[PDB]
Design a binder for these strands. Structure first.
Length: 1240
RNA sequence: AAUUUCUACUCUUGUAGAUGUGAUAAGUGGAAUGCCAUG
DNA sequence: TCCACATGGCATTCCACTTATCACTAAAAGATCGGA
DNA sequence: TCCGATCTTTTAGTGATA
């Protein structure tokens, strides 16, 4: 018996708030005269310049370390193959433990505990490894022991510039700590070595082995192209794709040579490219041979390896040098232009072209690789000139035509034979386009260069000159200048004499593009330190001398106080907590023991003195300092904390590995009494009440006890401080005072406050002071950003500002992570079966469509959110897309989409949470592959497929309603928690709390009245005999005389090869070819019923736009075309199947394909709908154009509805199950069987 | 037509909703340019 | 499979864009600096 | 030239069933 309001305070969530600090008094003067802002700007610049040096040291240690790795890989290969062949759970855990073993084996080289290495280099690697995460990378001691990087004196001075400020690199350290770590982290060296690169190498090895086994005649070829690449010269082409060579494939250079072996060296522009592995695979594919088909059947693509983590990328391919500045590019192109007019190239080209217009053209030839380009630029189609020449060679003569077309691809043609093959329209089009191009070039040379390159117009005119010159170069590359044919030697020589100086314009074009499309520089905020090695890392009153960041509250306003260092020392300035009635600021007092799991052993067991006492003698030791009463450290407690093994005996890892529940329980009990009397005895924690703690033997584990213990030691009090002391503190410069500010703290604000402002007010409301549910955290950052009725546009960028970023944590009383959250949600859904279901369909046309269904599948509300607050976000986002791709092609600025997508997604998120709190329903969302959504966003990033999922998860993880009371469930004190804690999409399961991930196939293309899908696939129906065979499988066809319709009967025990093999429930189908007459909707608008939209096929494997069709009209036109009598209602199929002409059979398969076509779309006028081919058993032929609200209006509403009944299946399967866990998805066959059972 | 920041309006120098920051690393996808074969 | 309408394999720039980790700290301990 | 204050650094380690 649980409630909907019980889903609160499940787990901690961490957020960050941003504010603007307004200076108070003359403190803005005090930071200005002291010169801190420029000092932090130079410090950030120094850090940015020092980062390449320090990870140069990191890369040096890496490539010195993992070069010595030599391991077997057969166990991991067998584990991967076993898990891939049989996808069971225990095989998965075997794969994880093998991957962890190999990760530890790789990491031991960094650690220095590697078995195969001898002891001296082991201790050298260990003591060098001890220095990458301390101050040892700046004193040069690591540089002395590790290989001689030998940073120059400039970088030595740069390292001296960070003297006594190594804690600024502290966040860097935990960054690089993930590089050298083995706990399965995606930003680690051994995770990439084991889990990422090794399966790819195994795949390459296996596909190479089966490709050699299938066809070995290509075996020599790869060795040959290996001699083309000239790398791995001491290795065999079989040995490279063997497992042990992977012991070489760790350094960046070796994987670079592997990827370049797969790709091939690319030389400079103009010359050919050295072919590689995938190149020759594609070339063998494109032969249209039987060998091409068999290599097409197996996979025919080698996969490149991922880059190493911290290393840098090189190549053997040609790299084009980049233009350093805009002045250099405009100056160099001005000299290029002047040297080009000095060579009088334009009149030279005019001379050549009036020569080709006035001499015979049998002695001038055209290269065979440009016939398609000339055909596409000249005529409307690229296949015009090739087919014209092919038919002309036929007419001047089956097999002979094939050798003719084999000769056409590689033999160069003289241009008169093309003129005689084509028409004179080709000649005049050629002459006018040459006129157009040389007039463009003339305008290019006549027009002067722009003065600068800072704005768009100069960029676009320079682009215009460049592609005019380049198009002249392309037009120059049409002719076959080689003396292999009978080209005129003088004209060939002068065409080289123009083309060799037309060649560098292409490289100039690429250089200008590489300089031109750079992102324009923008002013960026940077971190302030205020000459302090640790700024605002904590709020504690002991560290308030060191961190120097405290807060004041003044009659509802909030202030940040910073204590600067006086004369380079820590001036311990304090205040007097006067009585409450005195006017003044209210200082917050912070009492925080950070985390007992790391403070307790550090402050009591992991000291130097206790260890020095305990190695030499075993007697227990009293500890006196920082204690009211000295605490006793016994032998067994230190053995529990330091057991010289990974499983600590109070940790449940020891209980899981061993099974001694009694000893683990007693060890846990003793450890809990030890931490109890330590918290009693310690100076900081002796004033904290600990009475809510249960007896020690009643505690299940360490994590639960820590979760209950943690929010007792977090405390905030408030003490009134005299105002005059604070004003003398700021006026003397001893205190930097700032005011936290946003939009809602202005005096003119009278509406509802922001959600972040609600969190900030809930932080300091006395209810949260009584019981801390939300918590102020440490590590608060300060940033400075330089500058970039009456209404001011972009007023916030007019002046330089100070910004404050502060982390908070909501649901602090709850545990850090939830336990069995999905079990709780399954329990609540099992106790509440009547809950609604919200189908969300994300699309590319209308984007987001919602449908609401009840427990019985009745529609409650359906909506397409193209227009929210009467604003068409879809159309605006589409035109933003159109101008983004237009600006990309025009070398303009590219902008961003994230802001507008975030605004529209915020509107739709508020809508769906409004309906969520109104209906207490669950949402259902289609499971989509990452590759599919990535390709969909690639063809059109108008779709929000992957972006909206993150916003839904983030909003449903921590949910606060602004209109709700604070103390009520859903307010800022008890926020709603309806989804699992977000970890990563890889470990995101099929169900995250109230959200479900349902399979994507077969949701849109389904009749909701009968559950009908198309059981055929039309790709298998290609030949005429296949069409006749499939026409044999139908039962019979009858012409209705009342309504003029056609009824075709079908049983799925026929046409099995032409069926897709998806057996539905209902064993009969009656396809209805309804008469194409005009019906009316609920609005009464006329519309012709049963019409279809079919793409217009141009020729074989060629399709254009789409055209409407009315299947009964052309069908009866077919029957009166052949003279078939059908008004008697006889069996039409045996009457028509005897006619063996292919045109007839093609017509009826076209009509039955069109009536079996479900999704009927027309984007030109924009009608999207479906028209069910099978009549409902109550005699209804469904069209969604009827606009009846009980059924979906359009096809995407239909898809969202079917996703909703898929979720209905999911919760029915939840109800009948007793394990309180969902099934691992559903299959298509069970889904369509279930919906056919429900419908009919 | 204003905002910690973003989106949408202008009745109030504002309104409605959203807003995990910093650091690091990798990957994806576009556009242009070439080399090579295909309809 | 869900989506379709000039291409496939690569190579080099440039751009946005996504995902995946880390902390979300006070005290212990060492380095340093001013005193006799 | 060696001690006592003090400022900077780094450090500590949990979660799953009777």
């Amino acid at each position: 018996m649980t409630q909907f309001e019980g889903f609160t305070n499940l787990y901690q969530v961490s957020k960050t708030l941003r504010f603007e600090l307004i200076p108070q008094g003359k403190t803005l003067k005090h930071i200005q005269e002291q010169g801190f802002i420029e000092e932090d700007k130079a410090r950030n610049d120094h850090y940015k310049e020092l980062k390449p040096i320090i990870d140069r040291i990191y890369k040096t240690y890496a490539d010195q370390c993992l070069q010595l790795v030599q391991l077997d890989w057969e166990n991991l290969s067998a584990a991967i193959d076993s898990y891939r062949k049989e996808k069971t759970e225990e095989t998965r855990n075997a794969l994880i433990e093998e991957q962890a073993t190999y990760r530890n084996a790789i990491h031991d080289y960094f650690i220095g505990r590697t078995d195969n290495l001898t002891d001296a280099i082991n201790k050298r690697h260990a003591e060098i490894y001890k220095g990458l995460f301390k101050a040892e990378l700046f004193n040069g001691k690591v540089l002395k022991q590790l290989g001689t990087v030998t940073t120059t004196e400039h970088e030595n001075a740069l390292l001296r510039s960070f003297d006594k400020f190594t804690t600024y690199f502290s966040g860097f350290y935990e960054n690089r700590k993930n590089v050298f770590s083995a706990e399965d982290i995606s930003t680690a060296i051994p995770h990439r070595i084991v889990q990422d690169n090794f399966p790819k190498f195994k795949e390459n090895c296996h596909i190479f082995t089966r490709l050699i086994t299938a066809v070995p005649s290509l075996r020599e070829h790869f060795e040959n192209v290996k001699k083309a690449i000239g790398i791995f010269v001491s290795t065999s082409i079989e040995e490279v794709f063997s497992f042990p060579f992977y012991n070489q494939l760790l350094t960046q250079t070796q994987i670079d040579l592997y990827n370049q072996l797969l790709g091939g060296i690319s030389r400079e522009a103009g010359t050919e490219k050295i072919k590689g592995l995938n190149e020759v695979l594609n070339l063998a594919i494109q032969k249209n041979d039987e060998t091409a088909h068999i290599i097409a059947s197996l996979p025919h693509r080698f996969i490149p390896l991922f880059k190493q983590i911290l290393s840098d990328r090189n190549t053997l391919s040609f790299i084009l040098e980049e233009f350093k500045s805009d002045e250099e590019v405009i100056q160099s192109f001005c000299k290029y232009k002047t040297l080009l007019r000095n060579e009088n190239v334009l009149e030279t080209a005019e001379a050549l072209f009036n020569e080709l217009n006035s001499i015979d053209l049998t002695h001038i030839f055209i290269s065979h690789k440009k016939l398609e380009t000339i055909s596409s630029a000249l005529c409307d189609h690229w296949d015009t000139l090739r087919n014209a020449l092919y038919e002309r060679r036929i007419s001047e003569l089956k097999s002979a035509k094939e050798k003719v077309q084999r000769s056409l691809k590689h033999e160069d043609i003289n241009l008169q034979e093309i003129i005689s093959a084509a028409g004179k329209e080709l000649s005049e089009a050629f002459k006018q386009k040459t006129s157009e191009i040389l007039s463009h070039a003339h305008a290019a040379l006549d027009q002067p260069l722009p003065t600068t390159l800072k704005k768009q117009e100069e960029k676009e005119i320079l682009k215009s000159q460049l592609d005019s010159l380049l198009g002249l170069y392309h037009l120059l590359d049409w002719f076959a200048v080689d003396e292999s044919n009978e080209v005129d030697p003088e004209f060939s020589a002068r065409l080289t004499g123009i083309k060799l100086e037309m060649e560098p314009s292409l490289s100039f074009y690429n250089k200008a593009r590489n300089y031109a499309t750079k992102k324009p520089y923008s002013v960026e905020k940077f971190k302030l330190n205020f000459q302090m090695p640790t700024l605002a890392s904590g709020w504690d009153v002991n560290k308030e001398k060191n961190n120097g960041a405290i807060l004041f509250v003044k009659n509802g306003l909030y202030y940040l106080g910073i204590m600067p260092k006086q004369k380079g020392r820590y001036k311990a300035l304090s205040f007097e907590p006067t009585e409450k009635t005195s006017e003044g600021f209210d200082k917050m007092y912070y009492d925080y023991f950070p985390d007992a799991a790391k403070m307790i052993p550090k402050c009591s067991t992991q000291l130097k003195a206790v260890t020095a006492h305990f190695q030499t003698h075993t007697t227990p030791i009293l500890l006196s300092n920082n204690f009211i009463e000295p605490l006793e450290i016994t032998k067994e407690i230190y053995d529990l904390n330091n057991p010289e093994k990974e499983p600590k005996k109070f940790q449940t890892a020891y209980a899981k590995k061993t099974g001694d529940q009694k000893g683990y329980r007693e060890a846990l009990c003793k450890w809990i009494d030890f931490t109890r009397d330590f918290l009693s005895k310690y100076t900081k924690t002796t004033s904290i009440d600990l009475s809510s703690l249960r007896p020690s033997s009643q505690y299940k584990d360490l994590g639960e006890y820590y979760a209950e213990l943690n929010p007792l030691l977090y405390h905030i009090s408030f003490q009134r401080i005299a105002e005059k002391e604070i004003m003398d503190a700021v006026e003397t410069g001893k205190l930097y005072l700032f005011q936290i500010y946003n939009k809602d703290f202005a005096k003119g604000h009278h509406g509802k406050p922001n959600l972040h402002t609600l969190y900030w007010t809930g932080l300091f409301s006395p209810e949260n002071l009584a019981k801390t549910s939300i918590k102020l955290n440490g590590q608060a950052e300060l940033f400075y950003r330089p500058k970039s009725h009456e209404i001011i546009k972009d007023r916030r960028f007019t002046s330089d500002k100070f910004f404050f970023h502060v982390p908070i944590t909501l649901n602090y009383q709850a545990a850090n992570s939830p336990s069995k959250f999905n079990q709780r949600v399954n329990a609540y859904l099992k106790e509440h079966p009547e809950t609604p279901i919200i189908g969300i369909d994300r699309g590319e046309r209308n984007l987001i469509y919602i449908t609401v269904i009840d427990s019985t599948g009745k529609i409650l509300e359906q909506r397409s959110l193209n227009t929210i607050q009467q604003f068409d976000y879809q159309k605006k986002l589409d035109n933003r897309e159109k101008e983004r791709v237009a600006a990309r092609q025009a070398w303009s600025v590219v902008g961003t989409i994230k802001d507008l997508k975030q605004g529209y997604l915020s509107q739709v998120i508020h809508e769906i949470v409004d309906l969520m709190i109104h209906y207490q329903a669950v949402v259902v969302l289609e499971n989509l592959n990452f590759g599919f959504k990535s390709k969909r966003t690639g063809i059109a990033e108008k779709a929000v497929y992957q972006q909206f999922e993150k916003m839904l998860i983030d909003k449903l993880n921590c949910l606060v309603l602004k209109d709700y009371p604070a103390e009520k469930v859903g307010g800022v004190l008890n926020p709603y928690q309806l989804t699992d804690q977000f970890t990563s999409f890889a470990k995101m399961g099929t169900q995250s709390g109230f959200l479900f991930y349902v399979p994507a196939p077969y949701t849109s293309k389904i009749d909701p009245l009968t559950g009908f899908v198309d059981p055929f696939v039309w790709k298998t129906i290609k030949n005429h005999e296949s069409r006749k065979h499939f026409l044999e499988g139908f039962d019979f066809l009858h012409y209705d005389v009342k309504t003029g319709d056609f009824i075709l009967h079908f049983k799925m025990n026929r046409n099995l090869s032409f069926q897709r093999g998806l057996p539905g429930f209902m064993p009969a189908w009656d396809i209805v070819f309804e008469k194409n007459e005009t019906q009316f909707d609920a609005k009464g608008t006329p519309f012709i019923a049963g019409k279809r939209i079919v793409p217009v096929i141009e020729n074989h494997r060629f399709t254009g736009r789409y055209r409407d069709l009315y299947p009964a009209n052309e069908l009866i036109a077919l029957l009166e075309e052949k003279g078939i009598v059908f008004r008697d209602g006889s069996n039409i199929l045996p009457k028509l199947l005897e006619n063996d002409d292919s045109h007839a059979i093609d017509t009826m398969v076209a009509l039955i394909r069109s009536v079996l076509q479900m999704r009927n779309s027309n984007a030109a006028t924009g009608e999207d709908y479906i028209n069910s081919p099978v009549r409902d058993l109550n005699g209804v032929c469904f069209d969604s154009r009827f606009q009846n609200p009980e059924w979906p209006m359009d096809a995407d509403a239909n898809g969202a509805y079917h996703i909703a009944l898929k979720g209905q299946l999911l919760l029915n399967h939840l109800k009948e199950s007793k394990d309180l866990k969902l099934q691992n998805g559903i299959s298509n066959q069970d889904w369509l069987a279930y919906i056919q059972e429900l419908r009919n």
